[PDB]
Design a protein around this ligand. Structure first.
Ligand SMILES: Nc1ncnc2c1ncn2[C@@H]1O[C@H](COP(=O)(O)OP(=O)(O)OP(=O)(O)O)[C@@H](O)[C@H]1O
Ligand SMILES: Nc1ncnc2c1ncn2[C@@H]1O[C@H](COP(=O)(O)OP(=O)(O)OP(=O)(O)O)[C@@H](O)[C@H]1O
Ligand SMILES: Nc1ncnc2c1ncn2[C@@H]1O[C@H](COP(=O)(O)OP(=O)(O)OP(=O)(O)O)[C@@H](O)[C@H]1O
Ligand SMILES: Nc1ncnc2c1ncn2[C@@H]1O[C@H](COP(=O)(O)OP(=O)(O)OP(=O)(O)O)[C@@H](O)[C@H]1O
Ligand SMILES: [Mg+2]
Ligand SMILES: [Mg+2]
Ligand SMILES: [Mg+2]
Ligand SMILES: [Mg+2]
Ligand SMILES: [Mg+2]
Ligand SMILES: [Mg+2]
Ligand SMILES: [Mg+2]
Ligand SMILES: [Mg+2]
Lengths: 248, 248, 247, 248
């Protein structure tokens, strides 16, 4: 299959190339990523579907992340940057700023105003603490909602959430008050209020919490996702376990 | 023509395309503007000579104005920003802050100090009043100047003036005192003083004045340009009829 | 002229420094592009800062920008701090036309007040009064007596653009009268300014066109002209040398 | 030796000088600092390796700090600002703000967002209290970690830590609960938990504590570092004695 794109690569006509790419897996593209030359990398990135383009970008080394964000054509930029999970977006920009603070500024200029807001908050954190690892794309609900309401909410919180298997519950002020699983929603009666299904003794993590402490906590409680809070006890993000394996 | 453009786009060769853009009229490009795909618009705006690029921009909707002031490359920005007439520059910046005040701020930073000085003044007026429509790029002279001197002045005022067919006359304090046309000047004797050709009975409009009042007034007296004064009677700008036709 | 080149052959600081300290800026200005990067670099290396600045104020905007990029940064703040504010603005503008990043850097090098001062001037049209004026004039109050004004002028002199014309403002700084150095000298040392000053002052607005400044300058046969803002406050003076230079 | 430096300045030739700068100690450079003229200091700062360049800046008077942050070329600025310890960077930026608030602002723009985040936090505290002296670059751990885990932890905490000879202990909420020394970790069993080596009897100082008290307290208990907490008991920084010796 590596030759299969190169077959399509050499073919010069995109149409053959576009049908392989739409079924190539990111990781299988990631593996063969560095036997590819500038013109190749350029064209595959010219119209690799934006979800996949973004996905590959996230798994490259910071050096190559920066290189690729100076490679792709600018009409493609806002797409890819807007497709990135915010955690991955921050990492990408930090990678960029390390070599080119000017371009870092340029990139952020491209963002939708809310997205820039979001990333700018995340970027303020130490890359190797919870904040530097978290993403704000989680599902939060309040105590009074019933299970039915929570499900209807999750099915449109779904397009953009990092994960929906864990639903966090905060109050009026947005401070953490409980945690609930998708599995829990399912076993329970649709009009059960969340307040008796939620677990009130939530294990949480601070934005300055060291990543290996996050890793230990994750291995101890055997959770794949962990909530992150600010000084006021407010849920500000979640750290997913995949992003913790990557610190090894 | 239309085919002349699309051919050049697909060929990828900037030869055919710079050849098309340097002779295409902005309005013919504006007409086909939303038969264009993201990469196309980028490329036309990357290589359309700056005066036309600015021309198109002024005729896009505020929404696309904001968007394309974000797609274009930064070296192109300061050009387009400096190439806009000050009324249109103000409009464009307003369109941007409506969506993205962060980027609104970064843009103004790109402006030269005179332009930021100038634009910030206009930005202070209500967009549907005389100030929201005026430009400071008008030509003013004193009553004592001779037709010969006024004419020599026009030839170095022209590059930047909105219009030079009407010449406005102010005093020591710069408050409005008279008006004369380029035609009155040509009909007149080269050593004739302005104070004797000018019309002292000038119809003016205040920054306060609602845009439709600018329209009724423009239509009655059949002027294509109308002067704006402040509360102390000082000329601060002129409103031309084209910007008033565009109020529909 | 070769007297320069002999100093070149010397390779010597002193041999070159001795001619540079007695060369007139205009005589340096004439042969300036009989000089190569190597020459201009070294002449600028230790040419006395006042003169260095003087030459700079008189180069074409393209070469000014170049000149501000050749000299070593320890010399930059010197030369920049020596420029009259009118000339400093013009120099930075020249730079920004080609390189806005460097324009930003230069301004970073300024003393905070000089930056403030230049930044005000930079907002004006290069060909209107504000673009031509310099804020380095002498202002006094109406109640001062002649001796007091002279005292001021003797320490106002080092930095003032000119001291031959003294302008009179009030508590809030609106123009009140104009006075000459000559008037001060013919006059009695305890005479108050308010009886010697001329109250009907001819002024120019910051948006006033430069050729109107030239006419006014030629009509009233003045060499310096005061510039005011919209509130009637003296904000600068335009000297006639800078108006001849528009021709 | 010391005189060998002036040789290289006079050499005009860079290589002779880079050899000197590469082995001169900051203090030996600081000693001779104002027998130097502008052209020299510039060149010494043009070519002095960034840790040393930052070291010298840090021991200069606030006035020369402010000055030399203006003489150095901007490509060096971002280096030196990022190379400073956070306590010193906060001190240096204040030195600049006292003379030139405009430039004070531009510098902060050069800062990386986490660095700006951190420094802005330190800037809020009074220069003559614990906050004005502390640095957040300390190492904190949990009670449950073993001696083994911490020792592994310190080997990736050290590069940025002010000091690692004292390791501090906080809880779920990050409030101070205990202290232990690096020697305590080394003597102890690799499987021993921190909660059993740590001294729960911690001597602390709040952010508003006057410097003289930090000195009084440091001299009594014969400590070289002292922890700082907020009003809710959360560890926010450490004060080292070298910054207390330099209060004279
Ligand atoms: N951050 C958290 N803090 C506290 N409890 C949590 C947190 N995240 C999830 N939980 C709890 O963990 C459980 C979710 O586990 P899941 O439903 O995946 O089943 P599991 O891993 O097989 O274990 P079990 O079936 O025993 O719950 C729920 O009880 C949920 O309340
Ligand atoms: N805003 C204004 N207020 C008052 N008077 C004006 C204004 N604008 C123009 N005028 C006067 O009206 C006249 C219109 O002159 P213009 O150059 O438009 O000639 P025209 O319309 O081609 O010929 P005509 O005016 O004789 O029909 C000008 O000479 C000017 O003096
Ligand atoms: N900008 C100005 N506006 C109005 N009056 C001025 C201005 N500048 C100078 N004057 C006045 O005009 C006169 C010029 O005197 P100056 O020092 O030029 O000697 P002069 O050329 O012989 O003039 P005079 O013959 O009038 O004395 C002085 O009285 C001065 O106060
Ligand atoms: N800030 C502090 N507050 C309270 N206790 C502290 C603090 N810092 C250190 N300690 C305790 O004081 C002890 C002294 O530290 P350290 O081991 O460096 O001492 P030492 O001089 O090497 O040997 P000794 O402790 O025998 O004098 C540490 O073991 C630690 O438990
Ligand atoms: Mg990260
Ligand atoms: Mg993730
Ligand atoms: Mg408008
Ligand atoms: Mg217009
Ligand atoms: Mg000027
Ligand atoms: Mg001058
Ligand atoms: Mg401090
Ligand atoms: Mg310290």
């Amino acid at each position: 299959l590596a030759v299969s794109l190169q077959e399509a690569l050499q073919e010069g006509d995109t149409r053959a190339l576009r049908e392989v790419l739409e079924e190539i897996h990111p990781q299988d593209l990631l593996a063969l990523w560095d036997e590819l030359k500038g013109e190749h990398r350029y064209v595959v990135l010219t119209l690799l579907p934006k979800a996949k383009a973004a996905e590959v970008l996230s798994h490259l080394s910071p050096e190559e992340q920066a290189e690729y964000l100076k490679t792709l054509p600018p009409w493609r930029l806002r797409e890819i940057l807007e497709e990135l999970s915010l955690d991955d977006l921050a990492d990408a920009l930090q990678a960029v700023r390390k070599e080119d603070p000017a371009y870092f500024q340029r990139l952020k200029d491209l963002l939708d105003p809310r997205t820039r807001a979001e990333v700018e908050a995340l970027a303020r954190y130490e890359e190797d603490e919870a904040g530097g690892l978290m993403t704000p794309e989680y599902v939060a609900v309040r105590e009074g909602m019933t299970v039915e309401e929570v499900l209807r909410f999750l099915r449109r919180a779904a397009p953009d959430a990092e994960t929906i298997y864990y639903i966090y519950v905060v109050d009026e002020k947005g401070r953490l008050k409980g945690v609930l699983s998708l599995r829990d929603l399912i076993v329970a009666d649709p009009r059960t209020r969340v307040a008796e299904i939620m677990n009130p003794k939530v294990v949480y993590v601070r934005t300055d919490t060291d990543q290996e402490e996050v890793a230990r906590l994750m291995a101890d409680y055997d959770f794949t996702v962990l909530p992150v809070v600010d000084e006021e006890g407010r849920l500000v993000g979640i750290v997913t376990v995949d992003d913790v394996l990557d610190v090894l």
